[PDB]
Amino acid sequence: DVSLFFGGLPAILLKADTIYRIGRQKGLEISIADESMELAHATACILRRGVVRLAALVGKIFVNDQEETVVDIGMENAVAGKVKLRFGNVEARLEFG
């Protein structure tokens, strides 16, 4: 249903009822080694069926180049089923199935 793609990783198949921790800290669901990412950068969740919530913690988040603090994203917000994300200076892509 909702997949998250960072360069160099397998697609992350986002599951319900799970808090995804995103940062440069090791041992997180999404640990990215890039120096532009904060140790505790952000968190993602499935808010309800087909809808992902992203929340910025210590790091900044951009959705299609617009800064957001907290944002809910579903297929209706996508272009050709995709959304560009950026965490610090690290780009990623969400895809809705």
Asked if 40 contacts 19 with a C-beta cutoff of 8 angstroms, the reply is no
- What is the four-CA torsion angle of 66, 37, 76, 1, rounded to 10 degrees? 170
Q: Are strands 20-23 and 70-73 parallel, antiparallel or unpaired?
A: unpaired
Choosing from 1, 5, 12, 55, the residue that interacts with a second copy (CB under 8 A) is 55
CB of residue 21 to a second copy, shortest distance in Å:
4
Residue 69 interacting with a second copy (CB under 8 A): yes
Closest CA to 88 of 60, 68, 52, 65: 60
Nearer to a second copy, 69 or 89 (CB): 69
Cβ proximity to a second copy, 53 vs 93, nearer residue: 53
| Contact residues for a second copy, defined by CB under 8 A | 17-19, 21, 23, 25, 28, 38-40, 43, 45-47, 53, 55-58, 69-70
